[PDB]
Amino acid sequence: MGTVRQTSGPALARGDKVAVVSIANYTETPDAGHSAESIAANTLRAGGIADVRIAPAKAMEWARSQNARYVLSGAVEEWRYKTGVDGEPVVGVTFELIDVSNGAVVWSATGTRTGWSRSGLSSVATSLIAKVLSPLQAR
Amino acid sequence: MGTVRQTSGPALARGDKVAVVSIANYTETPDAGHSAESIAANTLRAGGIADVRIAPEWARSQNARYVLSGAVEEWRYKTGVDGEPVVGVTFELIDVSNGAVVWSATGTRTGWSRSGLSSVATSLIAKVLSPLQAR
Amino acid sequence: MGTVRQTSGPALARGDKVAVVSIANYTETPDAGHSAESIAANTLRAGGIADVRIAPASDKAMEWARSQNARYVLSGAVEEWRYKTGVDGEPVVGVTFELIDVSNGAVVWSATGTRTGWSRSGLSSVATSLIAKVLSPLQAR
Amino acid sequence: GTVRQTSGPALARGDKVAVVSIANYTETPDAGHSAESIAANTLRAGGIADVRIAPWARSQNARYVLSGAVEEWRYKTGVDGEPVVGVTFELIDVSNGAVVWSATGTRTGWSRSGLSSVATSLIAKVLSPLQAR
Amino acid sequence: MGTVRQTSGPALARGDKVAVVSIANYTETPDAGHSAESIAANTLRAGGIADVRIAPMEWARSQNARYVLSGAVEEWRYKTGVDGEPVVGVTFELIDVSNGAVVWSATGTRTGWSRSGLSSVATSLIAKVLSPLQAR
Amino acid sequence: GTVRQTSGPALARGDKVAVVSIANYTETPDAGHSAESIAANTLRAGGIADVRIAPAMEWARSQNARYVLSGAVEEWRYKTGVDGEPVVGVTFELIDVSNGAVVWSATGTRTGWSRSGLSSVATSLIAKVLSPLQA
Amino acid sequence: MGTVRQTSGPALARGDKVAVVSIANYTETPDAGHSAESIAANTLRAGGIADVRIAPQNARYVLSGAVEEWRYKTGVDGEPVVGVTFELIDVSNGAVVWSATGTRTGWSRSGLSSVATSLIAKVLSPLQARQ
Amino acid sequence: MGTVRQTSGPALARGDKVAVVSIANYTETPDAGHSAESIAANTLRAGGIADVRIAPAMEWARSQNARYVLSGAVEEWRYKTGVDGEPVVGVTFELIDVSNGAVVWSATGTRTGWSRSGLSSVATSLIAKVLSPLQAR
Amino acid sequence: GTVRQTSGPALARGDKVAVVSIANYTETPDAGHSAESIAANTLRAGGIADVRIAPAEWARSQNARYVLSGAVEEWRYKTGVDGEPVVGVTFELIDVSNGAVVWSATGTRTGWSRSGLSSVATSLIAKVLSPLQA
Amino acid sequence: GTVRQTSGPALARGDKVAVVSIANYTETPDAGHSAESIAANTLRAGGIADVRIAPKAMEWARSQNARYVLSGAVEEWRYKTGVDGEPVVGVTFELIDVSNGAVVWSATGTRTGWSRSGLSSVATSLIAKVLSPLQAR
């Protein structure tokens, strides 16, 4: 299993500052949202966004006080191994890119992936998130 | 396997403001309703609706033309090793100016033993909400 | 499979306002009555009834229906809504419905439906398919 | 399974029948309430116009009361344990309090059948002498 | 498949009013005595006895009932395990309210096979045990 | 198993018999009361007309009873496991009320087949054990 | 299947009054000592002792003892096992005039009360009425 | 099986009064020491000792005018774990001269029984063998 | 698994590097502290002379030129007998003079059933941090 | 297992030996007291007439006029886990000269029995072998 569906979106520039804010965790894996935040932040940087920062702890005023052009947020819908020995890793994530200038979602995407029996969950999550956020590469 | 049944509905415009409000969770999977909200909002956006927001009427203050609501009736793997993912959802589209349901749909799907629940859910919701694409 | 038994009933029209009221849950599956309410509301709408509304969370849902100027109330109960026990235990659904004339409280139509899926089927698929069958006489004519 | 009935009156469409508290002698929660709702729809399917379920019968001005008990309503234990239903019904004349009709029915499904299917089919068979004139 | 053993008894008529009073439950199946009570009542009625009432100690005297039907359930369960068979054991006494004497009594036991229903076995057994109380 | 009985008096149809507290030495609840109800109906089916179950020795003297049947259940269970066989063990004593002496006594045990019911085995065994007490 | 080992003993007449007293229960089986009492009491009467009572006076002998084993061994088809000791005591001087120990392992398809009833009957047979 | 080791000892006579005091229970089988007491007392009588009594320290024997005291301990008294786990018994006995408190005789015995034998049978058989030197001369 | 690194500065042997609070997003206790001590020894082995781990702005007091931080996303054996070790880590290198991330990397690895979790983590962390050699 | 013994003094029939507090380092309750009862009977069976078990702090022995004190510890006394888990026993002993407190003899013994042997039989046999140098000469 596995689909990535994304909208159109803006061309990000290297100098666009992006804050990663509170990716919700809708799974029973503790800290899956925080894992998705750390992976997503490094993905955005690896794609050429110079200045990416994860929020600590509306949230618009936090991003503006950070001089951020965009806020990347989203939700983890699935982040687990299926039950049983050799149960496969499954990942499901949604992202939204929020234009801090006007508050509107200017880009979003949903991605899911089902790994093989042999796969690691973090490998599957890291590959999927990189693919999902690929339209947000810079330059 | 599963079916989708949809009523007639209006032709949605790209500029139609849509608020996704409170998708109830009738399952024992925590947060399944919230997952359905996030997936549904992204689906409407990917279908061509520019302005979609999830509520935290409130919609009438946000100047929304339509509200999308609904309920998750099933959202789990069936029991046992290799128990297959199963999903059931209902959606309704409300005209904010008069509160009438102008479109509604029910969808269910059963995946294969190798399928991920979120993949089944995301595919089904896309199919179910497909008459709400921007024409 | 299972069985469906439906009495006779009036021909519904597109403009007949129907309120769906408190479907009782006699199973140990939480919220099964609320799931049946949602599926039933959409089915009635799929059937050509334009204005169909679910009462919010006893006889105060009846008062709500009267305040909505509903012509009929759809109520009922869920007798079964589970997978049978075990790996590959099959889904099973049992439901009863009544259509009540709001102006005088008379039951003008009622029906009972049950169904058993195979090991591979989904509970919600079975429930949705069955309620569609059971409520088919309430389609707009 | 099996069904055994007494003789009874020929009910008319207009006989107001209150379906009252069906006792649950099983460990399946609400099995009596399920039997009540199925029995009520059975009587209506059989042609009895005004059928009501108790939340008393005299305040509804019912002519007959349908009561009874559920003696069994479960799946037997284990994977593919078959459903089994046992029910007794009585029709009571409200004015004089006498039992004017009674029946007992039991049924054992096969392993792949639904409990609610077996109960619905059985209750219809048991209440068939109460179909309208 | 066990036994029924019945004593001699009086011939009952359709108009003999009969009260079924508390059937004791000596099993670990909740309400088995009440189930026996309900089945026994319908059995007597189906047997031709017109007026048969179940009690909620004199009482039957304040009911004009000619006979009291009482008893106890000794066994009412599925034996343990998958395909464990249903087993039932009952004793009944028929009491004359005009003097308190036991005028008829019977014991019955039955073991179904693995694929049978406990309620089917209880119902069939109780019909056979009370058969000498049919209206002649 | 076995059944062993002493000599005893010839019982008449007209002897008033009081069945009293049958002790339960098993971990099956109410086994003593079950044995009381089975034994009472057994004495009747054997021809004893007036036999009544007590709800001390004074109660039988209060009842104009000529004998008192008493005893104890030493075993009354299915052996453990699927197809565990029913096993029953009982002792009985018949007491003459006019002087308190034990005029008769019997012990009975039985192991039924794995496909038999405990109630059947106990009923058949009590009937055989009490058969010297027929009219 | 087990052993019975007894001392010499006196010849009991049908009129010797014998009181069966507290049979100690050294097993995990509730009431096994009481079960042994009722069985032993009936055994003595079945052997010809016309007057036997169990404690809850003026007897010539007293039967006492203890149950060392009274159970099924563990697992399905675990066999019944019984172990008992008995002492016969002349109340006139308190001396044990006869004693016996008995044990038995029944087969997997036998019941505990049968093994125990049969064993107790064999152990107490020296107390049969010889008149 | 196991082993029985006995010391030399005095020839007991029929009229020697022996009191069996308190066999210590060093096992997790409750009352195993009391079971050992009952078995040991019957064993002594079956071997020819006419007057044997079990107590309810050594002064109680003197207050019973007993010539000897049988004491001991149970080291093992169980079925080994699992279905068909075999019965195993281990006991130690000592015979004490009541006059001077000296141990005049002692013995240790152990036995592992067949999977299909009873613990009581193994224990009764072992105690009979262990105590056989105390048979009446 | 995978390893992906950004561009980064050329660390010299004399750059003081502080390793600070690697978050633990697993249910393995102390996995973050294990990553901190493995990462510190990896930086030294790569030719960086002075590496120190923070206890439980302090980097300013140490006059550190860079701060290495990160997060552990996975650090466990998969369930069952012979369940294989899985590791996932992210790192960021922070210029202390202005708080900017000047280098980041993400690494994941799935070992064989015969593999030890610490061997996988140590091997992965060495690979992930190799651009930080002298 | 193995048995290792030092040289020791030549014990006599009339030497008074007190068996004192054998430590229990196992999770088997009372394994130390069982070892004390077996050891005491082993010493008597070996020809030592006067052996007593006690109920620093050695002064109980100096009051009983004992020449030697036998002490020690149980390091292992159990069945290994599982159905047919074999009995395993490990003991250490020391013999103490009461007049000067010097350990004058010591020994260590271990034994793993067969799956079908009883723990008490293994311990009794092992302890009899370990203490056999203390038999009367």
Add this chain to the structure above:
Amino acid sequence: MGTVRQTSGPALARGDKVAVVSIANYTETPDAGHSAESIAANTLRAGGIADVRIAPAEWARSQNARYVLSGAVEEWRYKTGVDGEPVVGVTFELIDVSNGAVVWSATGTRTGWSRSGLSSVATSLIAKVLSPLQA
């Protein structure tokens, strides 16, 4: 499997006083850090360092120590299940007491065979890891 990685370091002399201080336990095996301390201390002695002391529970300044050996245990367990193999992971640092700098560090991991002992694997690994500190 398993690797040992060591930096360069100073030649230790037989007379260099080394204090082993608090090896952190990052495992769920109680006392694994203390076990590593005892094994490390004996390893350094076996390598020819005369004076090696484990700190009680920069106190080494008072013990006249030239070097402090510290570190952490990242793994010290049998993998789960019957015949689960022993796995060990350790890091070490050698610290100059006079200025507090790390002058040597190393990381070792090892996975034993299913038949080997955890203490055997830890002992062999620690000896190889610390072998640069032989005198």
Add this chain to the structure above:
Amino acid sequence: MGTVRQTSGPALARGDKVAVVSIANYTETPDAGHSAESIAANTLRAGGIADVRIAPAKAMEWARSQNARYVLSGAVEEWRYKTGVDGEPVVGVTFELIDVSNGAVVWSATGTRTGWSRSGLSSVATSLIAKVLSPLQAR
């Protein structure tokens, strides 16, 4: 199998008094340290050391009051059966011999041993400790 590694050390005489002092237990087997102390003390005596005693309940003061020439101390790092039916006994010990006249460690050793599925834990520990302490035989 396992390994034994010992440093050089002094030659002990039969008349050298040795005190065995608090062997730490770093296992989950209760009293394993006390068991190692008893085994070690008997091992030293079997090797020809006349006077050996185990400390009760700077503990150097106690040893000096016992006139001990050396103190044997150490730690138990492993003392258990591996998990499962037929799980083999495993033992790991460290020892140090302390010169009471100056507090210096003058001898130390590490031993580990993995037994067979059929062997007893106390047999394995006794054999290993005898091997480990064998340089301490009276020579």
